[PDB]
């Protein structure tokens, strides 16, 4: 039962290796950028609102959940 995911790991690498080819610009994985983007919005959570910081506080936080899912799972 352990033999299969290696091939899935092989292709998944092959995919994003080719996807690192099919896109020249390749950023940090593991949800590295979203956190800054949250604060980048926590900027606007400070900066933007007459209101919408409510969004900018809400919206941005949802970014961080996806790599959070990893530490979680």
């Amino acid at each position: 039962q352990f033999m299969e995911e290696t091939e899935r790991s092989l292709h998944d690498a092959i995919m994003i290796v080719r996807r690192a080819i099919k896109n020249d610009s390749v950023v940090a994985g593991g949800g590295a950028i979203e956190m800054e983007l949250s604060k980048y919005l926590r900027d606007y959570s400070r900066t933007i609102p007459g209101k919408q910081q409510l969004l900018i506080g809400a919206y941005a936080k949802a970014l961080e959940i996806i790599p959070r899912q990893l530490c979680d799972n």
């Binding site: 400070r46 609102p49 007459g50 919408q52």
Partner: protein, 132 residues
């Protein structure tokens, strides 16, 4: 005013700054306690709210607009655009000092701050209530 010439400008302009001021102080703390600062800054936010609520005002469109008065975080009429200042009651919005601008004697809040922080944690203390 007379027994304390020490008083903070604004009674409600502090909240938006404070959260941010904490949001600032939050982000560097990291770990859980970056957020333990943030949720501590989330306790702040009712101050314009119940005001706006009792004044039948929209709390968010103020406290948010409040949080958008800044360059850095301070309560002061020199920069109401680039910093916070003051407050209103019936409209609820920030004022300066001599505008409508609210103040607080610096004595009272820190005590109110101190108390709620301490009562809640002892409320946060126990998980049981038992009897026979």
């Amino acid at each position: 005013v007379l027994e304390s010439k020490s008083v903070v400008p604004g009674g409600g302009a502090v909240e938006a700054a404070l959260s941010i001021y904490l949001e600032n102080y939050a982000t560097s703390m990291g770990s859980r306690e970056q957020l333990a600062i943030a949720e501590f800054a989330r306790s702040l936010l009712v101050i314009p709210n119940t005001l706006a609520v009792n004044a039948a005002q929209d709390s968010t469109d103020l406290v948010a607009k409040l949080r958008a008065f800044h360059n850095e975080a301070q309560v002061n009429p020199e920069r109401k655009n680039l910093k916070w200042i003051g407050l209103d009651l019936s409209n609820g919005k920030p004022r300066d000092n001599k505008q409508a601008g609210v103040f607080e004697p610096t004595i009272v809040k820190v005590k109110s701050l101190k108390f709620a922080t301490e009562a809640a944690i002892t409320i946060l203390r126990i998980d049981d209530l038992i009897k026979l």
